[PDB]
Design a protein around this ligand. Structure first.
Ligand SMILES: Nc1ncnc2c1ncn2[C@@H]1O[C@H](COP(=O)(O)OP(=O)(O)CP(=O)(O)OP(=O)(O)OC[C@H]2O[C@@H](n3ccc(=O)[nH]c3=O)[C@H](O)[C@@H]2O)[C@@H](O)[C@H]1O
Ligand SMILES: Nc1ncnc2c1ncn2[C@@H]1O[C@H](COP(=O)(O)OP(=O)(O)CP(=O)(O)O)[C@@H](O)[C@H]1O
Ligand SMILES: Nc1ncnc2c1ncn2[C@@H]1O[C@H](COP(=O)(O)OP(=O)(O)CP(=O)(O)O)[C@@H](O)[C@H]1O
Ligand SMILES: Nc1ncnc2c1ncn2[C@@H]1O[C@H](COP(=O)(O)OP(=O)(O)CP(=O)(O)O)[C@@H](O)[C@H]1O
Ligand SMILES: Nc1ncnc2c1ncn2[C@@H]1O[C@H](COP(=O)(O)OP(=O)(O)CP(=O)(O)O)[C@@H](O)[C@H]1O
Ligand SMILES: Nc1ncnc2c1ncn2[C@@H]1O[C@H](COP(=O)(O)OP(=O)(O)CP(=O)(O)O)[C@@H](O)[C@H]1O
Ligand SMILES: O=c1ccn([C@@H]2O[C@H](COP(=O)(O)O)[C@@H](O)[C@H]2O)c(=O)[nH]1
Ligand SMILES: O=c1ccn([C@@H]2O[C@H](COP(=O)(O)O)[C@@H](O)[C@H]2O)c(=O)[nH]1
Ligand SMILES: O=c1ccn([C@@H]2O[C@H](COP(=O)(O)O)[C@@H](O)[C@H]2O)c(=O)[nH]1
Ligand SMILES: O=c1ccn([C@@H]2O[C@H](COP(=O)(O)O)[C@@H](O)[C@H]2O)c(=O)[nH]1
Ligand SMILES: O=c1ccn([C@@H]2O[C@H](COP(=O)(O)O)[C@@H](O)[C@H]2O)c(=O)[nH]1
Ligand SMILES: [Co+2]
Ligand SMILES: [Co+2]
Ligand SMILES: [Co+2]
Ligand SMILES: [Co+2]
Ligand SMILES: [Co+2]
Ligand SMILES: [Co+2]
Ligand SMILES: [Mg+2]
Ligand SMILES: [Mg+2]
Lengths: 216, 226, 216, 216, 216, 215
């Protein structure tokens, strides 16, 4: 079974050894349970700092996105280096390169690809290219809520929903490209807290707090 | 300053020497008028044919898009080879590669980059990266109409509109499938809006009048970013 | 052991799903019988079409050949994508790249390399580099005929011959570089109909209609 | 002439629009005065943060250096993007790539190359490969002091010294590779405060506060 | 006007900087006279030393050619490094890469490309791709002779001949691919002594001992 | 376990078949004993020859090193081609590329990377990146001596020493090589390449060699 894990950039902002460790464990563990794993890393606050500074000097939007992409790639190298023998030792820069890299039978870690999208879209593209039926989005909230839970207090986690529900809820988590891709290739998305990465197998069994998004 | 020309795949389906001859001429005329030019080529019926066959054997959507991309790149090599000394002799395979290639001060010709988008999105990205204020979409209709002019008769060509208008004209008509025919896709519109790029939709049959079109003195549609 | 299969461009001109299905099937068959397979695809009518148009506008012969090479590569991607996990996911652009790609232990699919030759020469080069003792040319024709079966009716098939017989017959199929390479490295060439890709194992035993060309 | 500017990673830690801006004008100015410019960017606090976290999870020293190198490249992209038409739009990853990139006649911006050295060593190697006779180290101090001015109060700036003096002062500013290279190729090094980049032409004339290091 | 210059590997066997100095001189002579120059270097005795040793341990013919190609590339780097600012600083490894490298408007130096041919064939391909109407073969003999002048003593130089004559004379210098290419693209070939490289302009004007081969 | 074997350029200057056949058999000996092997080849006399000529025409030091690097790469291709199926068929040009190449589970053969260092420094970098605990330097001398045995008569072989001893002796291994083996605690064995036939015995400490302990 092939699975893709998107790791929120916020995971890297914590500057917390435990995050990396728990991720390392989780990949080792998925492997032992017969999964091939691809990982996509977000840009986080590093991306936002570089983007903000570049924007203030008039750097255009393409190049701003590219700085965000390089920040995401820095996080990809960190993860890749933490996996040593498990991972193919190259961070692909495009979907085309990911396909080549995935051919080596090992874990592949990637950052961004192209301006105008997020790393959630990259995770979807990479899930599609690897025939992964499940994309896990490991982020800093427990699942999908009615509204953004870091604005709105007492908002309820939605354990099971569709991509058409999600679109309405979102009007970052998943961008338009990500949703288009998971819909056309019928990829199931699980949104979970990265804190619960130590419990990843239980989440895939549906035993633990998460949101499951069905493609329609 | 800089301009991007998207050339519809349908231009290549015609298999006509005059098409290439006239594109070639227009580029020279743009250069001689002080423009740097980037060119994006569509995949056309070659793309569709490969996509259809691959889809019949169960090949997934990512790989279908890639076949479409490789068909577009074949057209890009044709165009690039027709330009000889004017062009940097490399077809970039990503936006990042385009930026590097654009650095050589010559014409750059590209095809597709990534699954889930069209060559119009590529042309928008490449316009954004080259600080082109104008993207020209040279296609097999004279401009933008209220509805598809190859489906609906005596709809009127819309000479000047906004991206908001275009979004409504094109809304609800587009499939997520590899090989879908589009004018401008969602990524293309997002990009031209965020970077304030004006889009001119014209017939490639009038590439011989490319300067007059830029001056607003020939049949075309001008789309203003909002 | 290692075998190279050249697939005529005419195979791709048929725009027939059943062809790909049998190629796919014939390669899994070879793998299951202990063969490592490399595949070279021809440019076919797409190549001739681009070449003709480019030639009309005065494009030089190097660039015409390159357009034919890119058309061949488009067919290589199609075949590579049809093989999914069996193939290393990269189409090598040179013999040097083929050697690197072959190092991954998987099926490698290539198109052309260099102006002034055909994809048959590429297949020979790739046979030589992979220590393949046999090169199979799967074409639109049953074998080597006394002359061109496209043009002449009732001409007969030569089940067996040498590389100088072939040169004399030819002065398509195999070009000068292809013959020089198979002669210097003593590679046997089997010419067969791509329809018969199903009996590829029977053809290799010598138990189906084909022409075997011995290197001298 | 050709000149190389090393920009301390501390320049990027300031998260200050002013810094990038003043650097932008300095290259434009150097260009207008007939200089070809190469730029090498340090990794700064981003590099330190990634290295510290990776070290805590047992990542080996090669990979720690590589994280520092990727952080320095992120800063190189920022600078390169700020220069737009003036710069060749590729960040070289080795000295060999730098030499190819430098061939385009434009500004080249680089980060790190190889574990076991600093970006000062990169700036030296790049100065040597570009036949630059002057390397400017633009850092967060006015020049070379008797001892580290960020530690030792009341220490005096040394306006003119040799590479053997510097070696004794240091026993990072310049590492062993950097010193070896500037000695063997007789490259003069100017240490200056990056805050005075606005005044860069006056520094090259010797008419502003700086330290000039002569190769011996 | 574009011209290609093939420099015999024997030029590099001589182990003398006077040869490089004259070649270097020759290229400035050509540039200053309005020529764009491409250079192809032979492998010489280094290639022969590696091929012989590899052949003794049973290394196959593809790989023997590749060792010869790498030897030719070492000579290409030497020449390219001797040209400094005049040359684009990349040695292309294929015809496709040459075309990209030629796009920079500078001198391009190459070695070999592909097994089964010589550097003369490379020079022809590169002449064809650069629209060069003249290929100069600078070798250790004054021109073309009625037979190999190092094997049969006292034979006459042929100052003016055709490619059909040459193919009869040769039944080294130019291989079958080289001849096919210069014929199809109508490229004139001048065979000269590399000792007379100082007098390339006079040779191009037909005022110095050489053989001119006309394509038929 | 992972091991790196640095082969002196002098090995390639000798021009005899046995050398290659006997390197070839060692790695197959090492592989069969459970080792993953990386190999770094020196530039030898080919390097010095190109360097000397280029230096005479005024070519700068960066480009002289690069010519030496290309000569080392030519030796790497020779070795790689002699190993056939055992090796990943790419010579990496940087430490970054080596790491990617090493990911294929096969033998990787490298030459130089970067001006200002030697192929011994490459071997140390590559040992560090592959988590090799042992770097073998197979050279034209039996081990480490109190001083250069070519330049000095009657000197003795030191069977066991530290990296701090070695840098006093050298005032084989360059400064980057020593820094890297010290920071990553890599043991270096210096041996004669003529004894590549008894490489397993050398690793067990059962033949003539010098072992250098990192301090
Ligand atoms: N209102 C209105 N007014 C005027 N015309 C309209 C209107 N509404 C519809 N139309 C119609 O648009 C048509 C013009 O569209 P056209 O010029 O052909 O542009 P197209 O792009 O569709 C053809 P084309 O120019 O051939 O190229 P594409 O198809 O982009 O690319 C091929 C294929 O490759 C894939 N791909 C490509 C690039 C990339 O980065 N990623 C990718 O995945 C993807 O699967 C692609 O499908 C025209 O005939 C009208 O009838
Ligand atoms: N309906 C909803 N339910 C849950 N979370 C929502 C939401 N709407 C918005 N969010 C927000 O989505 C955020 C997660 O996005 P995520 O951080 O994983 O993407 P990312 O990797 O792009 C972040 P970065 O920009 O830092 O890389 C949450 O922190 C939450 O505030
Ligand atoms: N004596 C002979 N015996 C058999 N076939 C012959 C022949 N002489 C010429 N041919 C022709 O050679 C063709 C086979 O060549 P093939 O099509 O395999 O090469 P290719 O892949 O280069 C074609 P494309 O240019 O379409 O890619 C047959 O269709 C046949 O007409
Ligand atoms: N004798 C001396 N004179 C001046 N500065 C000295 C010094 N000895 C040490 N330094 C220190 O050198 C520092 C500058 O090094 P620099 O910041 O240029 O290297 P770098 O780019 O490697 C830093 P980073 O690790 O942030 O990238 C100063 O901040 C100063 O504290
Ligand atoms: N008919 C003929 N006229 C002149 N020279 C001939 C010849 N037939 C053979 N030769 C030989 O060809 C040699 C020139 O070949 P050249 O050295 O240019 O090719 P090359 O670069 O392949 C040599 P290397 O293999 O050393 O690189 C001469 O030394 C000469 O002895
Ligand atoms: N104390 C010492 N003990 C042993 N050898 C010493 C030495 N000091 C210097 N050397 C010299 O170093 C040589 C070994 O260097 P080695 O050949 O391993 O490096 P290398 O591969 O860079 C050579 P090349 O430059 O030819 O490729 C010995 O033959 C010896 O001459
Ligand atoms: O393929 C990608 C991935 C990321 N980004 C940019 O990099 C930032 C960091 O990624 P993320 O963590 O926000 O998804 C994004 O906000 C966006 O600007 C892209 O442009 N394209
Ligand atoms: O290595 C190659 C392979 C193909 N071709 C060109 O591509 C066309 C397609 O190959 P084939 O299928 O015709 O052999 C050929 O006619 C030829 O022009 C080359 O120049 N070199
Ligand atoms: O070529 C280089 C450049 C940088 N670094 C690493 O990246 C850090 C950031 O560069 P600097 O700003 O410290 O020079 C260094 O301390 C060092 O760990 C290297 O290993 N090699
Ligand atoms: O494209 C090339 C160039 C060179 N060689 C090989 O390298 C040797 C050196 O080239 P030359 O100087 O003999 O032409 C040749 O004998 C030949 O084996 C090739 O195989 N292909
Ligand atoms: O990483 C390397 C490897 C080699 N060399 C150069 O190549 C020569 C040949 O390598 P070696 O065999 O001396 O180690 C060296 O003297 C040196 O000039 C380098 O500059 N860097
Ligand atoms: Co985000
Ligand atoms: Co370039
Ligand atoms: Co053909
Ligand atoms: Co530092
Ligand atoms: Co690989
Ligand atoms: Co040495
Ligand atoms: Mg379309
Ligand atoms: Mg020869």
């Amino acid at each position: 079974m092939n699975i893709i894990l998107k790791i929120s950039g916020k995971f890297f902002d914590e500057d917390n050894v435990d995050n990396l460790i728990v991720l390392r464990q989780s990949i080792k563990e998925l492997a032992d349970n017969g999964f091939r794993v691809g990982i996509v890393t977000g840009g986080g606050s590093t991306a936002r700092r570089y983007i903000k500074l570049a924007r203030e000097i008039g750097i255009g939007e393409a190049y701003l996105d590219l700085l965000g992409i390089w920040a995401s790639r820095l996080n990809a190298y960190l993860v890749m280096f933490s996996l040593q023998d498990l991972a193919y030792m190259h961070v692909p820069q495009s979907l085309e390169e990911f396909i080549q890299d995935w051919s080596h039978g090992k874990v592949v870690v990637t950052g961004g690809f192209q301006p105008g999208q997020s790393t959630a879209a990259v995770a979807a593209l990479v899930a599609e290219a690897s025939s992964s039926k499940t994309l896990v989005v490991a982020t800093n909230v427990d699942g999908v809520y009615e509204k953004d839970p870091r604005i709105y207090a007492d908002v309820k986690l939605i354990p099971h929903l569709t991509t058409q529900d999600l679109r309405k809820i979102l009007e970052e988590l998943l961008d338009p490209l990500a949703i288009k891709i998971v819909e056309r290739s019928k990829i199931r998305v699980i949104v979970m807290n990265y804190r619960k990465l130590n419990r990843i197998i239980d989440i895939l069994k549906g035993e633990e707090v998460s949101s499951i998004i069905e493609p329609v």
